[PDB]
Amino acid sequence: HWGYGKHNGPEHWHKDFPIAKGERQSPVDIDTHTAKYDPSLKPLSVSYDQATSLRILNNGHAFNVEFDDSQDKAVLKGGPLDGTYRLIQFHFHWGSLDGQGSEHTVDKKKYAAELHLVHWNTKYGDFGKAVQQPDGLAVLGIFLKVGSAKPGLQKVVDVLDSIKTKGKSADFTNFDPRGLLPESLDYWTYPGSLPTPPLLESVTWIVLKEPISVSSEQVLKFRKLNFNGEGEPEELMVDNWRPAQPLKNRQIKASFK
Ligand SMILES: [Zn+2]
């Protein structure tokens, strides 16, 4: 089974998933000198007012917070998108040290972690069907840098000891994802893929320009989780990010001048 550790890491993924070497893989480096402003781009509309969180779990690669996606409560529209996209889950990628951890980079610079809010295109009926379509998913990417604590993140941090090892889960209601957004919604966008197997090229990436600040103590809690399940040998969940992939024939557009 795939992972991030020397013998089963990103460099090996192609053997089981040949799409790893596709034409639209993620993440990529965002080159600001090459990213072009596109006047056709509409502003993002993020409606998270009635978001309904359900639970949080350790799946062996990250921890995901899942939401009720049965109704058009927490949805993303506008920007480069055609329809309505429902929020299904969010999770992070982070490093062993503060100087690395993000998947996307900006002018080659890495952040401490990256937040992914995953949405699926309602016209397909459910995530399982959406995930296989080129316009199936929209992922909002937000960079984290170390500084002042993010008050909206604390509820997540405080529950992590409860899902330390793989397969562990816990109820997690009333979490409001608006507390994880930066002030500005200026963004870059490009067509890409899921950055974990099965690596399907079905994602429209929306990467926010403004990072959010989190504290060292908050990020340290991420680093104490385990890739391994209970009873198995300890393996800290760190550096669960895929390196930048070739841009190839794609163009990154900017919503801002
Ligand atoms: Zn992710």
Side-chain angles (χ1 to χ4, degrees):
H1 179 81
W2 63 275
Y4 294 93
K6 223 309 145 314
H7 295 93
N8 63 1
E11 250 310 312
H12 291 89
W13 295 354
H14 77 273
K15 291 172 270 176
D16 288 305
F17 309 91
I19 323 70
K21 300 172 155 195
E23 304 290 298
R24 248 180 71 153
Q25 290 286 292
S26 290
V28 297
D29 177 58
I30 299 162
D31 191 303
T32 57
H33 309 106
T34 317
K36 190 183 158 47
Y37 161 74
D38 179 1
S40 68
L41 252 29
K42 188 165 198 182
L44 272 186
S45 161
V46 37
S47 298
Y48 283 176
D49 204 22
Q50 276 285 264
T52 305
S53 60
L54 292 175
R55 77 190 171 141
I56 185 174
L57 62 304
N58 181 331
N59 63 18
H61 313 288
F63 63 90
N64 295 174
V65 172
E66 312 186 341
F67 293 77
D68 188 322
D69 60 349
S70 69
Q71 228 57 44
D72 282 337
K73 295 182 167 164
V75 307
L76 182 65
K77 309 167 297 205
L81 306 176
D82 189 344
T84 299
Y85 286 73
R86 284 187 191 159
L87 172 71
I88 178 169
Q89 52 104 342
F90 74 74
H91 60 269
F92 301 80
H93 303 254
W94 61 91
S96 43
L97 292 173
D98 296 353
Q100 70 196 219
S102 67
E103 298 211 299
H104 291 90
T105 54
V106 185
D107 296 318
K108 310 145 261 202
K109 266 65 266 310
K110 305 174 180 184
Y111 286 89
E114 176 167 334
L115 162 63
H116 292 159
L117 291 122
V118 183
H119 309 74
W120 60 271
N121 186 337
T122 283
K123 73 171 172 183
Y124 298 123
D126 54 74
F127 176 82
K129 289 167 187 82
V131 77
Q132 306 182 118
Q133 301 297 129
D135 64 348
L137 306 181
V139 181
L140 207 178
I142 299 171
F143 299 115
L144 280 65
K145 65 172 177 197
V146 179
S148 302
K150 191 70 171 176
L153 186 60
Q154 197 65 36
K155 270 175 190 169
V156 178
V157 159
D158 289 347
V159 79
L160 299 183
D161 288 325
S162 174
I163 56 157
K164 178 181 196 216
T165 54
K166 159 161 176 46
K168 287 269 209 163
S169 178
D171 308 80
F172 193 64
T173 54
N174 301 100
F175 179 82
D176 186 341
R178 287 172 302 189
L180 259 20
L181 302 177
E183 188 189 295
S184 165
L185 293 176
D186 285 342
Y187 63 90
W188 293 285
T189 179
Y190 75 100
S193 72
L194 290 176
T196 47
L199 298 157
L200 300 165
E201 301 182 323
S202 63
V203 179
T204 290
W205 279 93
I206 304 311
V207 175
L208 262 21
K209 183 185 55 209
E210 180 191 318
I212 61 167
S213 178
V214 303
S215 70
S216 290
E217 297 71 54
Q218 285 178 325
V219 73
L220 281 174
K221 297 282 294 80
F222 289 11
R223 297 193 184 109
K224 297 242 71 198
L225 298 165
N226 298 341
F227 279 131
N228 60 283
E230 165 60 55
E232 300 198 275
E234 189 90 333
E235 187 179 302
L236 290 336
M237 185 179 276
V238 286
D239 292 309
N240 55 352
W241 47 275
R242 186 192 191 190
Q245 302 292 312
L247 187 58
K248 303 199 157 170
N249 272 34
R250 291 170 291 174
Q251 184 179 170
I252 300 179
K253 277 85 158 311
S255 71
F256 59 95
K257 272 197 274 292

